[PDB]
Amino acid sequence: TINKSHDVVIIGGGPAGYVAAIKAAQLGFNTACVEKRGKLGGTCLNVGCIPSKALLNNSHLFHQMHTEAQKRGIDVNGDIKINVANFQKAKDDAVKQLTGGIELLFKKNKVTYYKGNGSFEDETKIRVTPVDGLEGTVKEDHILDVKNIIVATGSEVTPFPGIEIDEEKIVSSTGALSLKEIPKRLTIIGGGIIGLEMGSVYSRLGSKVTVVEFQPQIGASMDGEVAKATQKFLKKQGLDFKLSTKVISAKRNDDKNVVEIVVEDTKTNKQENLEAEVLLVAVGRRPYIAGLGAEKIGLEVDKRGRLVIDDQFNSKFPHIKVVGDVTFGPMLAHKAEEEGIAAVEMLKTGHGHVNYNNIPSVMYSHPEVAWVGKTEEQLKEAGIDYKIGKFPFAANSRAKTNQDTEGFVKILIDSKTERILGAHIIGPNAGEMIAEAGLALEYGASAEDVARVCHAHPTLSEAFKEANMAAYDKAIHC
Amino acid sequence: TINKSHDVVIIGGGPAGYVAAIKAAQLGFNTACVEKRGKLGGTCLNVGCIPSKALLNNSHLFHQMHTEAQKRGIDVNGDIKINVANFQKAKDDAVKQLTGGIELLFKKNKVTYYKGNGSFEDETKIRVTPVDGLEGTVKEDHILDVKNIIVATGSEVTPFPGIEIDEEKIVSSTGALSLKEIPKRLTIIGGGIIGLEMGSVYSRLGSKVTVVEFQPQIGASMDGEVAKATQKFLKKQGLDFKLSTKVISAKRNDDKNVVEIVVEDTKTNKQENLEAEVLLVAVGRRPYIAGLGAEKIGLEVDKRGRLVIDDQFNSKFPHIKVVGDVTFGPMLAHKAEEEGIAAVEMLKTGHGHVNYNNIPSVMYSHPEVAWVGKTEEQLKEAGIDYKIGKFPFAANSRAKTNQDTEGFVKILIDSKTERILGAHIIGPNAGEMIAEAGLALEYGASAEDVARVCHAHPTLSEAFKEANMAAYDKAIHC
Numbered sequence A, B: 001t002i003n004k005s006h007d008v009v010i011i012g013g014g015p016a017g018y019v020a021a022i023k024a025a026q027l028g029f030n031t032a033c034v035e036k037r038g039k040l041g042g043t044c045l046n047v048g049c050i051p052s053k054a055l056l057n058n059s060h061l062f063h064q065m066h067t068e069a070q071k072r073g074i075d076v077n078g079d080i081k082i083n084v085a086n087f088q089k090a091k092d093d094a095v096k097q098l099t100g101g102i103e104l105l106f107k108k109n110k111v112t113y114y115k116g117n118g119s120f121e122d123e124t125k126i127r128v129t130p131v132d133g134l135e136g137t138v139k140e141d142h143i144l145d146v147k148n149i150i151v152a153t154g155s156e157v158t159p160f161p162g163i164e165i166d167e168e169k170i171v172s173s174t175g176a177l178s179l180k181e182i183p184k185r186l187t188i189i190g191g192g193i194i195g196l197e198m199g200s201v202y203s204r205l206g207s208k209v210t211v212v213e214f215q216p217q218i219g220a221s222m223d224g225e226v227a228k229a230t231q232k233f234l235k236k237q238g239l240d241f242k243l244s245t246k247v248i249s250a251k252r253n254d255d256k257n258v259v260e261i262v263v264e265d266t267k268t269n270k271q272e273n274l275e276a277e278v279l280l281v282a283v284g285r286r287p288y289i290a291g292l293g294a295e296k297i298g299l300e301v302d303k304r305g306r307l308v309i310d311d312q313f314n315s316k317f318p319h320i321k322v323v324g325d326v327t328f329g330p331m332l333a334h335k336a337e338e339e340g341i342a343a344v345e346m347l348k349t350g351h352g353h354v355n356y357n358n359i360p361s362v363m364y365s366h367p368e369v370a371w372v373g374k375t376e377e378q379l380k381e382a383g384i385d386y387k388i389g390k391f392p393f394a395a396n397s398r399a400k401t402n403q404d405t406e407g408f409v410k411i412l413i414d415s416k417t418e419r420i421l422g423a424h425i426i427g428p429n430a431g432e433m434i435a436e437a438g439l440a441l442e443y444g445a446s447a448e449d450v451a452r453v454c455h456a457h458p459t460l461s462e463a464f465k466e467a468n469m470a471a472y473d474k475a476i477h478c
Ligand SMILES: Cc1cc2nc3c(=O)[nH]c(=O)nc-3n(C[C@H](O)[C@H](O)[C@H](O)COP(=O)(O)OP(=O)(O)OC[C@H]3O[C@@H](n4cnc5c(N)ncnc54)[C@H](O)[C@@H]3O)c2cc1C
Pocket: A011, A012, A013, A014, A015, A016, A017, A034, A035, A036, A037, A041, A042, A043, A044, A045, A047, A048, A049, A050, A052, A116, A117, A118, A119, A152, A153, A154, A155, A156, A173, A174, A194, A288, A289, A290, A291, A292, A323, A324, A325, A326, A331, A332, A333, A334, A335, A336, A362, A364, B456, B457, B458
């Protein structure tokens, strides 16, 4: 065991933790970050955002090249095949480069990178213990004398009791992202974004995808109209939805090399049997504090397993802050990053801020689905008087030119002030376009404020312009 | 001779004119629009923006299937060849749909659409003349007595004296957009946006492209660094450049089936002989007023051939406004539309508005090139002290996952106010991302204002957020 001192020590190297480390160092703190997995970037970079977006993008292109080339004047007299090994390689190389990038950022900023497991020795010190196989891991235990501690231990997949998750036949998102072969049938439990995205990926590559969802509609969180329109275009794309249906159990049938599933329709409590070569368990994600030693010092943990904090990210101990997926708020990478930054700026200047009323959500299917601000259900349930502004991409020149016009832009404004209250988009670049609504929302802009800004022609962004025109006045192209 | 009365009469159905018509109608004006070509949408929709973007998008895919497929896990065996007829059809279909679309907007908005040539009868009356082979043209001359006239006759290709454009071997942008076969060699006069886009299209299709440019750099009005980087990635994609070189002459040679070109090295005053199956003349575009009868009533026309107007779009006659390509300002479609709306709004409330300092410019190559506001050269010339924020897409997670990392975002801010003065982007979706710069500038946003807005992860837009972070402080992932 050996002693070490730092001003700030971050437990966790994911979006919230490594960004907090970089920021603390730029702000002048002697900073250290403790991560046990072997690479920085956390869930997002290693088994989440990055690899999933890589598969989505490449699977989309394969799809375009396979069924949309001829109508674009491109004749292929040969064959268009998916090379699973190179498909995976493309994703693994992207992850590899990015994880390396973070380590380089840590070096440039002088962040001390401890490879091991971090736990509270007591409320004022952190002990770093080595990880057996992990190379580069600490040679012996390290006791870090620190002034400020930031907990960013993140999340884990929510387990399904009774379902043995082997990342081969019955997989979690982590297994789905590394499938060595396109399964004939992909059955997915849960209609969440993570599940839907993996569904889209594989059906594009030739898998028969079935989505078993407890609730009536899917999406969970998106605007009503967006949610139904989403399930609509996904079914149209080949995904089979089993709404109001509960997965009961499942186990791998090695002899028949098939996963036997058992569902139950809630609108009849009538049981049923299903089968799939690969089963994806996507019933959500939850906070992860295992091995942290939070129980040792009395850190408050709510009934949902989240580390309780106040509006300044403080735990019951003023010098111990908590950020990211391990605590309150949507479990998104951009949210985690800004909390990491806000927490550190607080340490430096005494203040920081995160706008929970302006955090966007995005599903990277095609078309993409993105939204930020308030939905219609939320405005109604709050008795807010509002007006709607909608513009379809079918009326957008750029979209038409791309022969890809599915979707629309919907702007929600205050009937009184005409201030933008929410934006919802389903379109070819929804994820990027949503940044526009974010800027408007952040500044409290009005639909007219956006409508009056000259947007380049011909671009998809013009749909956003016209949708705002339709909210307080009238669109020109529809 | 037929007689009719209208509140507003618009000459020209291009972006400025047809949008003015729609707007005038919406604002309760008895509106009429006169167009002689046979389709609405003017230059942009029939032989400009739309057709070019279509060729660019489809040729981009062709290029991707040839060079980007394998590394993405997509095996495409066998010849991959362009079907010119179908390539042309894909473009022609998009134009047909869009032109048909505007006519539906006219019917819906009750705009009187006169197919023929519009010319001034006197200061307050316009006559519509039938057009020789115009489908659906007026069968008899019409005399429209109007309260307000809006001129939007647009522009045309600037010819090169001594060189005859036949749209077969020696072509203008119009002929280039409809080439029946991919020329073994395509040589282009002028490295403006139009010249560069056509060059990119055919180079991707197999033509050996050569760009002859009089100036020392391409782009015409790009920021210095952007112009250089633009030439570099276009050169990397196969285009050959001959800077500080002006064409002197060129002529067809039906014996060798080639165009014989003569150019002059501006540095050595020495000439060179060039040869190409197809020559594109893209030395620019100019205002169009032929057959408008502007001289009959003595409208003011400057040395550039433009119809002079005041800051209210007024000609020497208070009731005669002018908008679009035929008058002052950049010759772009979104600029024209904006003026069309502004003019009409002035006729209604007595005031319209166009922020000429926030008009974006975009080249739809790949990567795309987009900018708005001041370039570095313009700031220096003004003696303005400024700071730079630069972030490369090579450091952006989404760009990495897409295996498309060329380019960067450059933000220019006032050193004292930290107010954003301009944005320049070279990237996969620059054209869409520039809208963010549009909103920021319009609202007087500072770099910090943009940097603190939560941008979804992982998106290309995060690079816009980080470039701003670097401009006034420090980027995280840089
Ligand atoms: C398949 C999938 C796709 C996703 N796609 C998106 C998307 O497109 N966009 C988006 O915004 N979000 C997406 N997310 C969610 C996003 O990944 C998370 O919100 C984000 O990674 C959380 O970051 P964090 O830093 O709070 O936690 P984490 O990223 O979970 O990381 C915490 C880190 O700390 C380590 N750690 C924990 N305890 C200890 C300890 N005691 N000692 C040392 N290290 C410890 C972990 O090993 C881990 O690396 C996705 C998630 C999944 C699973």
